[PDB]
Symmetry: C3
Subunit: 368 residues, 3 copies
């Protein structure tokens, strides 16, 4: 197996774009939503936990997520990338690039949680939580879905992380919750998220081929459709569109197309986008009957679930998708999508609860 | 014809960079120029019309612009990208990438108009206008210049859209007009525009070859030269440089080098940049004797015209350019540049007028 | 020698990312640190001197830095890129791309100085200074290290410019000095710097190969480690982390890994990051006993020195690096690193002093 330089180039740039989603994307997104007096602290927690995740990833995370192990985790053979030769190839790129690309997904996932909960959680408590939850939730679930584990070996479809990233983070954040002064800044973060998301979705093909291209176009289309879907629902329910509605719409479509983007046709991307924008609206509306920043987990959670379900529909050849695996009916894919979603919800929740409680028992959770 | 992965990678990244020009580039540019109390509304109109253009593009826009038809429009054979095989190649990249790249130019074009006029126009009126003007102006003109239509078949030179994007948008905006509180934000948008513009200009080569490289370097050089040209004129006329002058200079050179970048030598890029920065200054100065945000169409319009004229000069081999087509004197290229510019001005204006009047007759134009 | 399109693509995108570090990265970084009433002026000086450097680079800078000459400068054979054929290849990319990539390093270097000193220096004095110092300091030092000059011909290691960019700029700025109201904005600039830095460090390989990949990953790792190192020192010395501490940490690791990134293992990147974050903290702490914006040269200078020294340690094969050149002991590399650092400090200082004094004698240095 030889590395293709075009894929290497593509995937390093894609990694830079996913890192850009956290630093500064998600930080500016939450920075505009949360209370002014809490912005500096939130930006500090996002920056430090990001650093933390980068280090844990290289030390053991990548190895435990992508080494070969069992159905649930990999191994410790790649501690500090030990035994990965510089010229080792994975797919059609150098494995070092795979390490960085995958680590960038871990970072955005943690960013989604910390940016929202930063306001309410002690600093040392967030560090502890991030260590427990990245290690016992993000990593096994990344392993199950993308590392040849349980869900993969049953043919779950999740191109860029509807489960691993969004449902996973939404549940961890909502357990957290259970336990806007600057809209131009919200818009800027949304914009940075949108752009970085082309690396997230297209780079998820692992190569600059026709699947990256499909994912790119489906990203443009689902995002746009979700913006219109959300804005129309807002105009119908609230009388007029709003900037926050526009940005929330964009996030709803981005998140909804995430598991599907590399499997569906542009027709499907359009339908998924409209449904995700409306379901996102319905979702935050319901969450707002329990404020602001954690309602965002209503978008990530509901849109992730919807997107995951609808991947199992729109991948079908007859609906313009790339087609299910041989011998797989749409019914079977649906069942497998639902099982993947349930395992993620339950796995992430249990580990989140343990994470928050461990922190609470060591340093105390609620910021003093 | 087989896709080259290097070109695929390059052109997906270039597309992400052109999308970044609208979201958030042009939005932040206008956001800093217009009245504080109007910023949220403008950001909403830019976000929603952007979404709108993405959807119209995939549904019929691309097909009508790039399908084969007549001198003025393509066809409806590619409705929702029907009959484009996933692996279809166009040039040396997958056609799906061509769709996304071309659509991103439609988006920035509409962004230029909406960002300026958002303040003064009813929301539903802007949606109607965008539908009419994208469909009857952007698409035929894209078809005439880049889709093998009238102007192309006469050898018009316009590497990245001096006519299709800038003169086209300037005229539509100025008809609109006829019918700064945050300079750090203006600067940020200009900066985002500049960076995204490397994808706009370099990606316009369709491949990561020596023409992309020429376009890249000419972009650096024209922008810089226009900044100095504008700043010197300001120092001479107003006594000192200003930040807005600096940013306006950068836009003047970017817009002026747009039609020329892939055809000229760095010597020509320097000359075009100085002339565009000075003509831009002269232009806004004149427009300011008819405020702020629409004066920007003086830069887009005057610089686009200047850049289009000067492409027909500096493409010449003897002036360091790549050379005119065989059998084409500089005189002939000039005549063809001028004819292209006139057709664009007149075509865009007529359709803009119809667009605004249709809206005015349905929902009413002036924001209530 | 034929151009590889994958390398061409990679290196054009990398160039766009390094330009993004100056416009708007460093501008927003200083914009948040300096006095509110001085922001507009600083943004203007950064934008205009950036333009200035782009023009000088194409006119003679590139030629004098990368043409063949002597140990200290190149030649004037490439004036305005004369005699570089469009299809000329350098390494595995078109030489025009090499011109743009190298010019982008000149730009960020000047940005580091001007962004800090803008507050205190007359506009015309900064233009004069930039002309003298780019020409007699940046160019010879770029030539000595990367253009086959003195330091290169002794085997100095400096992957992406610990000397040419950071120590060089720190000294020029500190001579300048001798002669925060918006932390969200500081954070945004730091974030833009971090992301653009992947082009800076990875593109410094000149190709999308396994060395780019190593540089990418080492960038992620050193940055993150430096953030934790700085934050821990702050928590230990000041009682709690701060946002400015977080951002300063990130810059410390970025700057420290700059000379090393393509030569070291991830283990070394981690160690270099922790040491650079702590040394950066120690450094600004000492500089703050001589305010704010020039203390940043304590990060660039101290971290650059540390990173340069530690390249001569961690490149060793036994410490996971790519290995010293044949026949070179670690001791010898160390001596050569130290000599390179001394020459840079002394060369840049002497030329800075001449630059500032020439300006002072023509227009006067201190802003009126």
């Amino acid at each position: 197996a030889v590395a293709d330089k075009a894929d290497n180039a593509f995937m390093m740039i894609c990694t830079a774009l996913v890192l850009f989603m956290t630093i500064p994307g998600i930080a500016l997104f939450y920075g505009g939503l949360i209370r002014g007096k809490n912005v500096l602290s939130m930006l500090t927690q996002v920056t430090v936990t990001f650093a933390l995740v980068c280090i844990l990833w290289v030390v053991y995370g990548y190895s435990l997520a992508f080494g070969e192990g069992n159905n649930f985790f990999g191994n410790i053979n790649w501690l500090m990338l030990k035994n990965i030769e510089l010229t080792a190839v994975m797919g059609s790129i150098y494995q070092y690039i795979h390490v960085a690309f995958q680590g960038s997904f871990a970072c955005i996932t943690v960013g989604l949680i910390v940016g929202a909960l930063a306001e309410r959680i002690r600093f040392s408590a967030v560090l502890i939580f991030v260590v427990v939850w990245l290690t016992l939730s993000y990593i096994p679930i990344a392993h199950m879905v993308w590392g040849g584990g349980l869900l993969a070996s049953h043919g779950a479809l999740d191109f860029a992380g509807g489960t691993v990233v969004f449902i996973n983070a939404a549940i961890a954040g909502l357990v957290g919750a259970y336990l806007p002064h600057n809209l131009p800044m919200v818009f800027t973060g949304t914009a940075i998220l949108y752009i970085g998301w082309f690396g997230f979705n297209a780079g998820s093909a692992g190569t600059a081929n026709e699947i990256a291209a499909l994912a790119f176009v489906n990203t443009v289309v689902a995002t746009a459709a979700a913006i219109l879907g959300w804005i129309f629902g807002e105009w119908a329910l609230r009388g007029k569109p709003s900037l926050l509605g526009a940005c929330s719409g964009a996030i709803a479509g981005l998140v909804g197309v995430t598991p599907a983007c590399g499997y569906i046709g542009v027709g499907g991307a359009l339908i998924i986008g409209v449904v995700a924008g409306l379901a996102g609206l319905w979702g935050v509306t319901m969450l707002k009957r329990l404020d602001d920043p954690c309602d965002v987990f209503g978008v990530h959670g509901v849109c992730g679930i919807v997107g995951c379900i609808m991947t199992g529909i729109f991948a079908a050849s007859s609906l313009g998708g790339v087609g299910f695996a041989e011998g797989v009916t749409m019914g079977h894919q649906l069942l497998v999508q639902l099982e993947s979603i349930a395992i993620t919800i339950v796995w992430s929740g249990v580990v989140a609860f343990i994470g928050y409680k461990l922190a609470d028992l060591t340093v105390g959770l609620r910021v003093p």
